[PDB]
Design a protein around this motif. Sequence first.
Motif, PDB file in Angstrom:
ATOM      1  N   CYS A 104       1.014  -1.315  -0.062  1.00  0.00           N
ATOM      2  CA  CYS A 104      -0.009   0.103  -0.027  1.00  0.00           C
ATOM      3  C   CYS A 104       0.841   1.286   0.131  1.00  0.00           C
ATOM      4  O   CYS A 104       0.798   2.174  -0.721  1.00  0.00           O
ATOM      5  N   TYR A 105       1.923   1.117   0.743  1.00  0.00           N
ATOM      6  CA  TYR A 105       2.989   2.336   0.658  1.00  0.00           C
ATOM      7  C   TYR A 105       3.236   3.028  -0.719  1.00  0.00           C
ATOM      8  O   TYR A 105       3.485   3.964  -0.810  1.00  0.00           O
ATOM      9  N   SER A 106       3.102   2.079  -1.656  1.00  0.00           N
ATOM     10  CA  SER A 106       2.902   2.514  -2.881  1.00  0.00           C
ATOM     11  C   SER A 106       2.121   3.303  -3.618  1.00  0.00           C
ATOM     12  O   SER A 106       2.268   4.309  -4.378  1.00  0.00           O
ATOM     13  N   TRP A 107       0.776   3.167  -3.120  1.00  0.00           N
ATOM     14  CA  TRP A 107      -0.396   3.827  -3.902  1.00  0.00           C
ATOM     15  C   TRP A 107      -0.171   5.390  -3.190  1.00  0.00           C
ATOM     16  O   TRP A 107      -0.384   6.199  -3.765  1.00  0.00           O
ATOM     17  N   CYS A 108      -0.417   5.191  -1.804  1.00  0.00           N
ATOM     18  CA  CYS A 108      -0.322   6.587  -1.076  1.00  0.00           C
ATOM     19  C   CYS A 108       0.667   7.722  -1.792  1.00  0.00           C
ATOM     20  O   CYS A 108       0.388   8.913  -1.644  1.00  0.00           O
ATOM     21  N   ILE A 109       1.663   7.286  -2.222  1.00  0.00           N
ATOM     22  CA  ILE A 109       2.914   8.123  -2.812  1.00  0.00           C
ATOM     23  C   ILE A 109       2.271   8.675  -4.038  1.00  0.00           C
ATOM     24  O   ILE A 109       2.722   9.816  -4.283  1.00  0.00           O
ATOM     25  N   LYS A 110       1.720   7.955  -4.741  1.00  0.00           N
ATOM     26  CA  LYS A 110       1.097   8.588  -6.169  1.00  0.00           C
ATOM     27  C   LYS A 110       0.394   9.878  -5.981  1.00  0.00           C
ATOM     28  O   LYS A 110       0.114  10.425  -6.699  1.00  0.00           O
ATOM     29  N   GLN A 111      -0.127   9.956  -4.711  1.00  0.00           N
ATOM     30  CA  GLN A 111      -0.641  11.427  -4.412  1.00  0.00           C
ATOM     31  C   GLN A 111       0.224  12.576  -4.406  1.00  0.00           C
ATOM     32  O   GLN A 111      -0.143  13.793  -4.608  1.00  0.00           O
TER      33      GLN A 111
END
Length: 42
Positions: A11-18
């Motif tokens: 999940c840490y990879s998705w939050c960064i897309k922000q």
Amino acid sequence: IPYCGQTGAECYSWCIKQDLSKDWCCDFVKDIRMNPPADKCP
């Protein structure tokens, strides 16, 4: 790979897309009662 995913590392990879901040996700995936990895946020 359900909603966020299975563990926190993934999940840490998705939050960064922000594009907010490296600490932005560190506090997000960690607040979702998940298990964040130690090789992503010092």
